[PDB]
Amino acid sequence: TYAIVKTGGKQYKVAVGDVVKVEKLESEQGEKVSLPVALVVDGATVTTDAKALAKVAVTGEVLGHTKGPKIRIHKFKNKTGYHKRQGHRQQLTVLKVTGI
Amino acid sequence: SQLKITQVRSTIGARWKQRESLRTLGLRRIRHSVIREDNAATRGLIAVVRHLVEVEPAQ
Amino acid sequence: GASSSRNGRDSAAQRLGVKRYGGQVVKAGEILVRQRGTKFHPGVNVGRGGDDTLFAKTAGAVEFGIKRGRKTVSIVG
Amino acid sequence: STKTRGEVSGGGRKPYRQKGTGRARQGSTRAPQFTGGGVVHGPKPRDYSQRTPKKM
Amino acid sequence: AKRGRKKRDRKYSKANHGKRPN
Amino acid sequence: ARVKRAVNAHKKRRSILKASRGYRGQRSRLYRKAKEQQLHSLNYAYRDRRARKGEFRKLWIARINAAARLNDITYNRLIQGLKAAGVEVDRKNLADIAISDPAAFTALVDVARAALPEDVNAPS
Amino acid sequence: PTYAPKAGDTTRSWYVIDATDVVLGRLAVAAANLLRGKHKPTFAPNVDGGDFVIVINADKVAISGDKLQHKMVYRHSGYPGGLHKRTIGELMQRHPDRVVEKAILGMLPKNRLSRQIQRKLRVYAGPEHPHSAQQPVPYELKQVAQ
RNA sequence: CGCGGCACAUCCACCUUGUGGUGGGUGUGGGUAGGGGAGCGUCCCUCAUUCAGCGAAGCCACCGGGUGACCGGUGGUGGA
RNA sequence: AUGCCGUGGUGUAAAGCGUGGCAGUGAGACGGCGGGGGAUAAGCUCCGUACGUCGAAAGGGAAACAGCCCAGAUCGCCGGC
RNA sequence: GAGGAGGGUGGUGAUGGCGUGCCUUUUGAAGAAUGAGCCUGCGAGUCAGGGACAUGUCGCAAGGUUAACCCGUGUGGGGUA
Ligand SMILES: [Mg+2]
Ligand SMILES: [Mg+2]
Ligand SMILES: [Mg+2]
Ligand SMILES: [Mg+2]
Ligand SMILES: [Mg+2]
Ligand SMILES: [Mg+2]
Ligand SMILES: [Mg+2]
Ligand SMILES: [Mg+2]
Ligand SMILES: [Mg+2]
Ligand SMILES: [Mg+2]
Ligand SMILES: [Mg+2]
Ligand SMILES: [Mg+2]
Numbered sequence: 116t117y118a119i120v121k122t123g124g125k126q127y128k129v130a131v132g133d134v135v136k137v138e139k140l141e142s143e144q145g146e147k148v149s150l151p152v153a154l155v156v157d158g159a160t161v162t163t164d165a166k167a168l169a170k171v172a173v174t175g176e177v178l179g180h181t182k183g184p185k186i187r188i189h190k191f192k193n194k195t196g197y198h199k200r201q202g203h204r205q206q207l208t209v210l211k212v213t214g215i
Numbered sequence: 216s217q218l219k220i221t222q223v224r225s226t227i228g229a230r231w232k233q234r235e236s237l238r239t240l241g242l243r244r245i246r247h248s249v250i251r252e253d254n255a256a257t258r259g260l261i262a263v264v265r266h267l268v269e270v271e272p273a274q
Numbered sequence: 275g276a277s278s279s280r281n282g283r284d285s286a287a288q289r290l291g292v293k294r295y296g297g298q299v300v301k302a303g304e305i306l307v308r309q310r311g312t313k314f315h316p317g318v319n320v321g322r323g324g325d326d327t328l329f330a331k332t333a334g335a336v337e338f339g340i341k342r343g344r345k346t347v348s349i350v351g
Numbered sequence: 352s353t354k355t356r357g358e359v360s361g362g363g364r365k366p367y368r369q370k371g372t373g374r375a376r377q378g379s380t381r382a383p384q385f386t387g388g389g390v391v392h393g394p395k396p397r398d399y400s401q402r403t404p405k406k407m
Numbered sequence: 408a409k410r411g412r413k414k415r416d417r418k419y420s421k422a423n424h425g426k427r428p429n
Numbered sequence: 430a431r432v433k434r435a436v437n438a439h440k441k442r443r444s445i446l447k448a449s450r451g452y453r454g455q456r457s458r459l460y461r462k463a464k465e466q467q468l469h470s471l472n473y474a475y476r477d478r479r480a481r482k483g484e485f486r487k488l489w490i491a492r493i494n495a496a497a498r499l500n501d502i503t504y505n506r507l508i509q510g511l512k513a514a515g516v517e518v519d520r521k522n523l524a525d526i527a528i529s530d531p532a533a534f535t536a537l538v539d540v541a542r543a544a545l546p547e548d549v550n551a552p553s
Numbered sequence: 554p555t556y557a558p559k560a561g562d563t564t565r566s567w568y569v570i571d572a573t574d575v576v577l578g579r580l581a582v583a584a585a586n587l588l589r590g591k592h593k594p595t596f597a598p599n600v601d602g603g604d605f606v607i608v609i610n611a612d613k614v615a616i617s618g619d620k621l622q623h624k625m626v627y628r629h630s631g632y633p634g635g636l637h638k639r640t641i642g643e644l645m646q647r648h649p650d651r652v653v654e655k656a657i658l659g660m661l662p663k664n665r666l667s668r669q670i671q672r673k674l675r676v677y678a679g680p681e682h683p684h685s686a687q688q689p690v691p692y693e694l695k696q697v698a699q
Numbered sequence: 700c701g702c703g704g705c706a707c708a709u710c711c712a713c714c715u716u717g718u719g720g721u722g723g724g725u726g727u728g729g730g731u732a733g734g735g736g737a738g739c740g741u742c743c744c745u746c747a748u749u750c751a752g753c754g755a756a757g758c759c760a761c762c763g764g765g766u767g768a769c770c771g772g773u774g775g776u777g778g779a
Numbered sequence: 780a781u782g783c784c785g786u787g788g789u790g791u792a793a794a795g796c797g798u799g800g801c802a803g804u805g806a807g808a809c810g811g812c813g814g815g816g817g818a819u820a821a822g823c824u825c826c827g828u829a830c831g832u833c834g835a836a837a838g839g840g841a842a843a844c845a846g847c848c849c850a851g852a853u854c855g856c857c858g859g860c
Numbered sequence: 861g862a863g864g865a866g867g868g869u870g871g872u873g874a875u876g877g878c879g880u881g882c883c884u885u886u887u888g889a890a891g892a893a894u895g896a897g898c899c900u901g902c903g904a905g906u907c908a909g910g911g912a913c914a915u916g917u918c919g920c921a922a923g924g925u926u927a928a929c930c931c932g933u934g935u936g937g938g939g940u941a
C-alpha cells in the first residue's frame with residue numbers, strides 16, 4: 116500500500132519504509148510526526164474522499180536535519196555594471212515513514 | 216451596508232488618481248480584499264477605479 | 275530660402291488673472307485680481323490700484339457678485 | 352620618498368610622432384604606465400607629529 | 408514600399424491591441 | 430609599504446577556473462574568457478531553476494493527457510471532475526500513478542467522471 | 554524523482570492506417586502523434602518512443618477539388634532560377650506516397666530525433682503492404698467525446 | 700496563494716526602556732547616474748599570546764564551509 | 780465636460796514643508812490623446828498632457844521585435860490558482 | 861566483496877527545451893560603432909597647510925589654546941606674543 120502525503124506545502128508519494136526529504140519541520144531527531152494525506156491506495160481501493168481521509172494520517176520519524184545543494188547566484192545585466200552575488204542552502208528534514 | 220473590494224488588475228500603467236485611490240481604499244496587490252463602509256465617499260473611490268477592482272455586496 | 279522671419283517676436287506673458295478666489299480668507303493688502311482695465315470692479319473694502327490691480331483693504335473672505343452689470347469683488351469683514 | 356615623473360631621469364622628448372604609426376600616442380618615456388617611469392601619488396617625506404593639548 | 412506597409416499592418420492583431428512601436 | 434598584488438589577485442582566478450572545467454575552447458583555459466562565461470552560466474541557472482517548475486508541469490500534464498485518453502476522457506474534463514469531487518492530488522503524483530499503477534488511475538477517472546455535471550455544456 | 558525512461562523500456566508495436574476517404578490533415582496528425590508516442594503515458598520529449606505506422610491506400614486520400622490544381626509544392630536546387638513547382642494533382646499521379654509523407658514530416662518537431670522517428674514510417678500507394686511478416690493491427694480514427 | 704530561509708523599516712510587550720539586546724504582528728526588499736551604511740582580502744609597525752628544520756612562506760591537487768568579497772581541513776612539493 | 784484655487788467631513792505609515800552636508804542631470808526616444816510647421820507626407824520636426832512605457836525593467840504574450848498588451852524578479856521548492 | 865542487482869562520489873554527455881559575447885558610449889548595439897591575439901608582472905582621487913565649510917568623537921569649559929623659541933638621549937616639561 117502507498118499514500119500521497121501532504122507536508123511543507125508540497126506532496127510526496129510514500130510507502131512504509133521510504134525516506135523522504137521535506138522542508139524544515141520544527142522537531143528534533145527521533146520524534147514522531149503526524150501528517151495529512153490526499154489519497155490512500157490499499158491494493159485496488161483508492162479511498163478518494165475528503166471526509167474519510169482526515170481520519171487517516173501518516174506517522175513519521177525524523178532522522179535529522181540536513182542541508183541542500185549550494186546554489187550560487189550572480190545576477191548580471193549587460194552594459195550597466197550591475198553585479199549581485201548571493202548564496203543559499205535550503206534547510207531540509209529527512210523523514211522516515213512508518214505509518215499509513 | 217458594508218462593501219468588499221477585491222483588486223483584479225495591477226497599478227502598472229495606471230494614472231495618479233487611480234493609484235492613489237487604491238491607496239485610500241487600503242489595497243496593496245492583486246487579489247487583496249478589504250471591507251469598507253458604504254458611505255458616499257467609498258463608491259466615489261470605486262467609480263474612479265472600477266476597471267481595476269471587483270466590488271460585491273458581501274458581509 | 276525665402277527669409278520669412280518678418281514676424282518672429284513676442285512680448286513676455288504678464289501673469290494676469292484672478293489670484294484669490296471666492297471663500298478664501300485674505301489679509302490686509304493682498305492682491306486679488308491682477309488685470310488690464312476693470313474687467314472686475316472694486317466693491318466693498320476693495321481698492322482699485324494704479325494699474326487696476328484690485329487689492330484688499332481689510333481682512334476677511336472674498337466673494338464675487340454683480341452690481342448693475344459690472345461684476346464686482348468684495349470682502350466680508 | 353620616491354620619484355615622480357618629473358624627477359626620473361630623461362623622458363624629455365616625445366618618442367615618436369602621434370599620427371600614422373599604429374602605436375598608441377605616448378608623449379614621454381617616463382610616463383607612469385611605462386616600466387621605468389615615475390610613481391603617481393607615491394610616498395613623500397612627512398612629519399606625522401600631532402598637536403595634542405597639554406591637559407590631555 | 409512593401410516593408411513599410413507590412414511592418415505597419417501587423418499591429419492589427421489581438422495581442423498588440425492596435426498599437427506597436429513605430 | 431609596497432604590496433605585490435599577486436597573492437591577493439590569484440585567489441579569484443583559481444576559483445573561476447575550477448568552475449570552468451568542462452568548457453571548450455578558451456573558455457576553460459583563460460581567466461578573462463572564463464569570467465565572461467560564468468556571468469552567463471549563472472544567469473542561465475537562475476533563469477532555469479524557475480523555468481523547470483513549468484517544464485515538469487508541462488510534462489506531467491502530457492502524461493495525464495495521454496493516460497486520461499486511454500480511459501475515454503480528455504484532460505479538460507478530468508481536472509474539472511477532480512475538483513468537483515474534492516481530490517486535491519497534485520499533477521506530479523497524478524502523473525506518477527499513471528505510469529506506476531494504472532488500475533489506481535482508472536478509479537480516479539471514474540471518480541472524476543461521475544462527479545462531473547451531466548450536461549457539461551449547459552450553463553451553471 | 555519523476556519517471557525518465559531507461560533504454561530498453563520503450564516497447565514498440567505496428568499499426569496500419571487505411572486512407573480511403575480520410576483527409577490529408579486528419580491522417581498526417583494521427584500518424585505524427587502515433588510515431589512520437591504522445592498516446593503513451595510514458596512520454597518523454599527526448600526519447601524515441603512510439604510505434605510503426607504503415608499508410609496504405611495513399612492514392613485515394615481525400616483532397617478537395619481546388620487543391621489538386623492550386624496547391625503547389627516547391628523545391629529549390631540551389632542554382633539561380635532553379636525554383637521548380639509541381640501541383641498536388643500532378644504529384645498524386647506519379648508519387649502519391651510522397652504527398653502523405655510530406656504532410657507527416659512537417660508536423661514532427663524540427664530537431665535531430667525526428668530524423669530517427671521518420672525511420673519508422675512506411676507509406677504505400679496500393680492496398681498491399683510487404684510487412685505481413687509482422688502483425689500490424691489496424692488503427693481507425695477516434696475522437697474522444699467531451 | 701502555500702511551506703521554509705534572509706535583510707530593512709515600523710509598531711506593540713520585556714531586559715541598565717535607546718549604546719541598545721530577546722520575542723510577536725503588519726509592511727517592504729528590479730535598478731543605471733548618484734547618495735548612505737556595513738564588511739572580505741594583501742602588506743607594514745606596536746602590545747599580548749601561540750606555531751615552526753619532528754618542516755614556516757609560496758605553489759599544486761582533493762574534500763568540506765559562509766548571505767557576498769572569501770575561508771578552513773587533509774595530503775603532495777618545498778626549505779625559513 | 781475636464782482641469783485649477785479655497786474650505787468642511789472621511790480615508791491612507793514610509794506623503795508635505797523648513798534648514799544644512801554630498802550629488803548627478805541639463806543630447807532623450809516611442810505609444811495614446813489635443814495642436815503648430817510640412818503636401819493635414821515621413822521611423823520627420825516643434826509644443827501641451829498628477830498620460831503610459833523604455834531609458835534604469837528582467838519574466839509571459841505579439842513568429843523574431845528598447846518604447847505595444849499583461850505584469851514589477853529578496854532566495855529556495857520536481858506544489859496550487 | 862568472484863560476479864550481477866540496489867545505493868552513492870568522480871569523469872564523459874547520445875538526446876530534448878531555453879539561450880543575440882565583454883567593455884566603452886548612446887534615444888537605442890549581439891551588433892556590420894569603439895577597444896582588447898594570450899598569459900604573468902606593473903599601471904589612476906594622493907599629499908602639504910593651527911588653510912575653508914559641515915559633521916562624528918575626545919579633553920577643558922566663560923573661557924579654550926599656544927606659535928617661534930628654550931631645556932631634556934624621545935614621544936616629555938616650560939613659553940601669553
Ligand atoms: Mg544602457
Ligand atoms: Mg503676451
Ligand atoms: Mg502710472
Ligand atoms: Mg623632464
Ligand atoms: Mg610634452
Ligand atoms: Mg625608476
Ligand atoms: Mg609641547
Ligand atoms: Mg562538456
Ligand atoms: Mg509558476
Ligand atoms: Mg521551437
Ligand atoms: Mg519586488
Ligand atoms: Mg536594490
Ligand SMILES: [Mg+2]
Pocket residue numbers: none
Ligand atoms: Mg550606483
Ligand SMILES: [Mg+2]
Pocket residue numbers: none
Ligand atoms: Mg616532506
Ligand SMILES: [Mg+2]
Pocket residue numbers: none
Ligand atoms: Mg610575507
Ligand SMILES: [Mg+2]
Pocket residue numbers: none
Ligand atoms: Mg584553499
Ligand SMILES: [Mg+2]
Pocket residue numbers: none
Ligand atoms: Mg598544508
Ligand SMILES: [Mg+2]
Pocket residue numbers: none
Ligand atoms: Mg605547506
Ligand SMILES: [Mg+2]
Pocket residue numbers: 805
Ligand atoms: Mg545645454
Ligand SMILES: [Mg+2]
Pocket residue numbers: none
Ligand atoms: Mg535640451
Ligand SMILES: [Mg+2]
Pocket residue numbers: none
Ligand atoms: Mg521634447
Ligand SMILES: [Mg+2]
Pocket residue numbers: none
Ligand atoms: Mg522622433
Ligand SMILES: [Mg+2]
Pocket residue numbers: none
Ligand atoms: Mg507624445
Ligand SMILES: [Mg+2]
Pocket residue numbers: none
Ligand atoms: Mg498627433
Ligand SMILES: [Mg+2]
Pocket residue numbers: none
Ligand atoms: Mg531628431
Ligand SMILES: [Mg+2]
Pocket residue numbers: none
Ligand atoms: Mg519606471
Ligand SMILES: [Mg+2]
Pocket residue numbers: none
Ligand atoms: Mg543615458
Ligand SMILES: [Mg+2]
Pocket residue numbers: 836
Ligand atoms: Mg520588457
